Design a protein around this ligand. Sequence first.
Ligand SMILES: Nc1ncnc2c1ncn2[C@@H]1O[C@H](COP(=O)(O)OP(=O)(O)OP(=O)(O)O)[C@@H](O)[C@H]1O
Ligand SMILES: Nc1ncnc2c1ncn2[C@@H]1O[C@H](COP(=O)(O)OP(=O)(O)O)[C@@H](O)[C@H]1O
Ligand SMILES: [Mg+2]
Ligand SMILES: [Mg+2]
Lengths: 74, 73, 509, 73, 174, 52, 52, 463, 463
Amino acid sequence: MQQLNPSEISALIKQRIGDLDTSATAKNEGTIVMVSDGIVRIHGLADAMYGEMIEFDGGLFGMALNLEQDSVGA
Amino acid sequence: TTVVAAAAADPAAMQYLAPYSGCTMGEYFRDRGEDALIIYDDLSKQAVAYRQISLLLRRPPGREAYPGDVFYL
Amino acid sequence: PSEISALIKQRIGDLDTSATAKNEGTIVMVSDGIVRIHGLADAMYGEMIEFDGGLFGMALNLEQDSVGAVVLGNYLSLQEGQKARCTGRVLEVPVGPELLGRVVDALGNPIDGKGPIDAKLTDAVEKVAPGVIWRQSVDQPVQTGYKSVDTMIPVGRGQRELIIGDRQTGKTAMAIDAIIAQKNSGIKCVYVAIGQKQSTIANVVRKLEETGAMAYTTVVAAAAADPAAMQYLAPYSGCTMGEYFRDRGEDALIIYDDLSKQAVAYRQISLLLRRPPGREAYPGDVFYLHSRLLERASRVSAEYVEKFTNGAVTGKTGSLTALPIIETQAGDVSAFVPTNVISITDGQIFLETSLFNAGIRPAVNAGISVSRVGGSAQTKIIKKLSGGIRTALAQYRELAAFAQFASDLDEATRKQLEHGQRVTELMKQKQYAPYSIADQAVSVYASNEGYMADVEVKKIVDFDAALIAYFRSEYAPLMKQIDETGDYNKDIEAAIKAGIESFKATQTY
Amino acid sequence: VNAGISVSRVGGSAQTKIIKKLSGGIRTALAQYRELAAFAQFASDLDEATRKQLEHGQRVTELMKQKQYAPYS
Amino acid sequence: ELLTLARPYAKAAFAYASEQGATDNWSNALQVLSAAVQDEAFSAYLNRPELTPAEQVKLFAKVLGEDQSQAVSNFLTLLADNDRLVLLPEIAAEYEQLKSQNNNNVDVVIESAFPLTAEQEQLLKSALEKRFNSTVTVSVEVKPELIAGVVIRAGDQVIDDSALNKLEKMRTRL
Amino acid sequence: AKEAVDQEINSAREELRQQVAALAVTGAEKILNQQVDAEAHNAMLSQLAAKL
Amino acid sequence: AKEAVDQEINSAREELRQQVAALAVTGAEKILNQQVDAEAHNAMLSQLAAKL
Amino acid sequence: SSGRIIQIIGAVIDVEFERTSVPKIYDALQVDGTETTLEVQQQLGDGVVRTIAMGSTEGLKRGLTVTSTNAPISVPVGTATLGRIMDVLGRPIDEAGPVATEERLPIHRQAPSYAEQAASTDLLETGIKVIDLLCPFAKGGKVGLFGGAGVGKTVNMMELINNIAKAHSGLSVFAGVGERTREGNDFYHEMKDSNVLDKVAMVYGQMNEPPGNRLRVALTGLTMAEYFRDEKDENGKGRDVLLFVDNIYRYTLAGTEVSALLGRMPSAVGYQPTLAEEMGVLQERITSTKSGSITSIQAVYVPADDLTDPSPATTFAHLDATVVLSRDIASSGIYPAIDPLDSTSRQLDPLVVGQEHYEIARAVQNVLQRYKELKDIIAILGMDELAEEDKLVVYRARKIQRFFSQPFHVAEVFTGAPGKLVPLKETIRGFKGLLAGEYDHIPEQAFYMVGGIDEVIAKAEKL
Amino acid sequence: SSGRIIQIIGAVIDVEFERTSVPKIYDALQVDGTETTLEVQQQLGDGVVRTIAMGSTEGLKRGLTVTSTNAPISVPVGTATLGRIMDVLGRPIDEAGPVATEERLPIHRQAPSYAEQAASTDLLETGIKVIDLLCPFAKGGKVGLFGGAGVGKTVNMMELINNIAKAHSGLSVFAGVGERTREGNDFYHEMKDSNVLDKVAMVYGQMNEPPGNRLRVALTGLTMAEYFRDEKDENGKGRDVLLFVDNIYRYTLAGTEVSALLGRMPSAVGYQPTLAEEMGVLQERITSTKSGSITSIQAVYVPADDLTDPSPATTFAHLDATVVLSRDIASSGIYPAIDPLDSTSRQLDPLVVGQEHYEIARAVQNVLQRYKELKDIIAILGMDELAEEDKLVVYRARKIQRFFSQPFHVAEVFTGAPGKLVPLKETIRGFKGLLAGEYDHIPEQAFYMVGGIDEVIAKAEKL
Ligand SMILES: Nc1ncnc2c1ncn2[C@@H]1O[C@H](COP(=O)(O)OP(=O)(O)OP(=O)(O)O)[C@@H](O)[C@H]1O
Ligand SMILES: Nc1ncnc2c1ncn2[C@@H]1O[C@H](COP(=O)(O)OP(=O)(O)O)[C@@H](O)[C@H]1O
Ligand SMILES: [Mg+2]
Ligand SMILES: [Mg+2]
């Protein structure tokens, strides 16, 4: 029995119960789930490329390094 | 003479088990009143094979990364 | 036969009447002295938890859905499905001038079989040291009775001096001699034994009783068979009993024995609770475990003690001295626990095995033993006299590499070796026989002025013992004058020199 | 064969009486000879006892040598 | 540990049910699913290594019969992908607790030494209403092990007046 | 030695109370087991309702 | 001599424990004390229970 | 009721019972179909306990029903166990029939309280020169024989038995914990060849057995000794009890093997986090109390010739006299290989052994220490760079090192020379003369493998 | 808008907020019941934040209401904080009353950018003869005081403060990061006696507080120093502030203790992964800017006297000078006790200090490090058999060692209140003359415990 994934969130699970369409919201948009020590975990971003350049709302820039099963480290 | 061969390309399980098979083969004479003699060659390599088997099972090692029960082996 | 009846009657009629809502929980997992509970939504960190059988626990981990708690008794009588309750209390021990001469468990339970302890106060085991504003400088001496320690590594009142060295080198002997030497200084002592077999504790208690030094000492014993919680909690419960005297104007001295074993017990407790380990599998917060214990030993100003007692003890100032003991493996002082402890204390006293075998007992290593309080913790005469000893040892230690080649050297360095060997031979001392400051002063002065330069090295110890006995016999008034005050004038120096000359002339040790 | 570190905890019970009573403290003789020769490499005095022991240890050491596939009796 | 891993699923399920006004249907479905997964034979037939998550969801749909919907099917599909199907009973317990809390209804258990009649139960119900809840669900339980008195258990709060008095007096004696 | 005598006196006086209390408590439990009725049960549970 | 005196004390301790046995049987009516005294004296009804 | 097995991982079974009838921490369980006996260790909750097996776990399924006994392991005690060989569970393995006693005692018990701690200092002369001179024993105190692999712990223990137990008027208990079966057979037949078999009780959980057997085996061995201690015969006094344990290190080693399987994080090297506590719980029952005295001899293994290893370094604090063997000395031909600079004892003080003996011992240690310090200069430079006193010290120290050698009564099989038994007075007189310089004219080869000082002079004259 | 505590493990608290209102990183939370203050470290999803406690973690329940402040920890700044003693949060602890000011700044700020670095590197002169010659400081640099047994390193610090104050009216800040309370009290009393307390602000984490304190006291002191620097008075120019950190080694271990519990894997020797990040974040705000400057003096502790482990190794990248105290040099009667051969600086460069300064320093270093080599030869043979050259070296080296001695003004006892504060030009002239040989005829006892060469000439002529 493993620990909770970043994708296991009450709001996200409620949305998933709602409907499974839009293919994870157009596959090119994410949602931050974790922030710690200069690392950000995002939920979504289906079309993320290993080494891609990700832009946040504030005007910053990230870089996706871990493309895991249900989240995207950056 | 009987020769039991577990070469360097054989799976680690075969190297782990070879001396036990040899000892069982040799104990046939001992139980029936006949003397016998067995020569284990490089028990250190059996210990290395057992260390490889144990580490792949995620067992915490002791000194020199040998498993806890390398003595009982 | 009737007083017991009246007591029990009034107690039964006093209480056990009402009903009260409580916050319960259920035991789930029991293993190796660790117990987990489902429930206790109001459990406090460090709170004391009761069990159905009468045992008492302590809550350490407050997880999201479970509470991990150690057991202060023996956990072999607990089963899953039993219930636990929160008491809204904290661990407390009895304190006062009634624990003197008694041997107590880590919770203040008499184990020597001499009846109950009548203590009128209880104090919390977890406290905080007084702030930086209430302290005061360290300028009062604690005599240990060793000619080497008192002259080269002085110890004041309120200092924290470490005793560190390999196994079987005399750490416990030094601590016990320090306790014994306090017969007349009138400072109370507390000795805490952690992770020692009960036979050694009994032998130490008997030795303290033989010399009469048990009339003012309290022994806290957390033996090797006691649970890890007791070995983890013992130093704090000893420190509270010590602090009783500090906050009321009197002086105290506490000796933690084998803080390494407390660290080991706490490591065992932390590992079973699934906390992440660090270097050498210790928990990350061992430093904070030792710091909040050693930082309580201090010296408080008269204002603090006047405030604490509401004007009862106006005049005086309190103190509390600590002598933690660490053991090292093959002189490896770069390990985790010794590195942590050395950083906190105000000094250390290294005991060497190679020096112990060679006959130098005590085996104090002067090269690497320091005391940051320094000269301010010495009486006037010893402070004035220790310079010659310190410089002689320094010179003898700079060129110790050529000690076996005295035949091929000039005259100056050969004389330096000749004097250094003699001063080194001077520092030897027996066990259980401490020196008052007058004896140390006389011996050190006789060494400084070259009165030992014409006696062969093999006979220095006999010379010193005979000289001290000769002064004890002939010159009692001078000895009492020096011991009582510690002055150093031209009169005292002239008297000492005249006595030494008459001894050399007319005694023939 | 390093005569210093090699033993047979069965001892003299595992050989015929001839070899049992002939071979005495031969092993301990060589064990002491090794240390004596290592300590007295530079000895310029060489009293007669040490000289005899060193002249006997070399005899015993050179004595025990044989070739591949040369079984004695 | 199991209760910890069931927080988000239970909270999401309760939020969705409350917002859709179908809490009763989800409660029934969750109880049925918890009972089904508690079964030994059904669980053995469910954990077969050949089954994809869709197969497990379809099996749950078949065993549940009616009362199923796209919501419950999606919930089970999401659970199956992360392999958290085994912890359904904790989800059901959490959901029931949340539903009871939202309705301002707390559960109490009254344990006595003798069976109680109607007036005592009603009196105790009225007394416990001073905890200011909607209602109390009193489940009385007889215990001959006790001698006299009633012990009431509300969540983690217990009120005792029974033979525990004897133990409390014993501790004070010794 | 005199202090040891005093400690023995105190030890005996402390020891006796434990057996005395244990036997008294056991007798009390026997009395309460002998009493078997619900009127006492009913009387004090009704007491508790207002006691809340 | 201390053994002599304490072996007198203990030889009296059987009688002292008989005394306190009577006293504890009288205390056994503190099962009334625990009680709200719904049966203010329930023990007087039958006190056969034999205690030392 | 009864439970069933749900996991088998090596030697650590675990069983699931009903929610009501879970057993206690150290209860004993019996597998229905076989003779395997389980001892509960942890209680995982939800009606599941985690046990270890007192036998081989080959051929055990999952789902075998298990019944409980509601009591810890119980072994027989009394005089009926005298002259018998027994296993972990106290079942006779010498094929002499069942034991004729009815007494039972659980093997898990609390240590004696601090109030009942009687400590005595009555010297015990073993007839070994280095043991008597440097680290004297005390009747009722615990002794340990530290050493590497093959440096002679067992031979020294069998020597101390010969010098004491044969002349001892009192019972004994030998408990082998993970050692060679051949040694056990040899000891049994040696005792039976003599007539002292009626004074010993033997417990053998040896080195060929599963870790469950080697773990809870010393506990039985000293459970018998505790009963022998705390016993009184009418019109009789307590009986003095000896206790010999072999490689108590194997007791902790067998706990390390089953550590991770019980679900614990490993400690510093590989050891279990509960090393110190599980060693103290055992070691605190061996002391001697107000009634009865237990003299204990324990051989303690040292892994990889490392005295810093956590287990030997933890064992030091539990012993009164510590005898440390060295591999260098053994490889140098000196037997016994006792290191004169690491052997210590609480009995070596002037108020117990007297002034003269204490002075002789301290002088010997000082000479050996100075020689140990000079050993480095004489290697790079020559022996002729030193002064005359240093050369004299080197010669005297070599003679002292030789003079500690001695032929044991039991070692005559390996070498052939008959054994010697040297009284204490002869040792003290010989070493006093050797320090005074009276024997500076004797070659150092005359001090090797001899008894008292007279044999040295005789051997020198023969040369 | 407020959350509840849901998990307490050691000093690491967890709080669960509504998903719409979750505090940012480094926000300050105030538990409603008590005076404890938390600060956020991570965000774990579901409105859960993981924090550490600035104070007593004992007596905290679960489900205890927590309110937020929506801003980092703000501390008081201004001229009203001079002469006070304050903890991490800015609360007075000297019991002198509340701090009478309203200006506050967050303790967490970005480092100065590249553009606003100082256009030059000025030279800072103290007056101590050893430091100003061999280990010159830099205006707005960073100075470490390595090593040193129990000695007047605190005496050196208050001498430095007195010298900086009486020469320049610039303020000072003392931030004891995990300091012994005894030494802190001694320092406070000394500042109170010398009437220098009007120009010092203090912050104390007293080594027995939760690691949040020992972690953020340095940042609080640095914020106070930053405000002091950035204040522009009467011209448009900032001041020149001096900042002490009494033990920088405690700062790393304070984060090391909390690193493991926060959910980070270990590193080389068990340190946190972000050791260099934390050290850089702290140490990059101590620089000289276009307006004002902050210069710092930081005592550094080397664990086990091994400076190759990461803790001092990562500090060495930031230091501009290393003053190494020594036991022996203080023993020989040289009070300041700075090691001449070992203590070095990055500022000893002919471009910044001119050519005569550099050449004099190099010549002195060469003489000293040749005399140190002649030690064994002098000890074995004596002074007579050396060449005619290398006797002058011995005499001049002894004279130089004596001439580094200095009387300390703050002492005022056993010295005579002898404030010297010699100008650098005087020392340069003196050492040039001494190396050249104009003073070669003067007894070495004259060069002891004086200032300029005029004083040594007067002392030599008097005798
Ligand atoms: N000054 C001395 N003169 C003679 N003997 C001494 C002296 N100091 C210490 N000793 C002896 O050193 C011996 C061993 O040291 P000690 O008893 O103090 O144990 P220790 O240092 O506490 O080690 P451990 O913690 O391993 O038990 C003691 O038996 C004691 O008699
Ligand atoms: N007293 C002794 N004198 C000479 N040789 C010995 C002596 N004791 C042992 N030896 C030899 O050294 C080895 C000792 O091994 P042993 O005592 O059987 O057990 P252990 O493995 O514990 O050291 C054996 O080979 C034995 O023959
Ligand atoms: Mg000790
Ligand atoms: Mg062996």
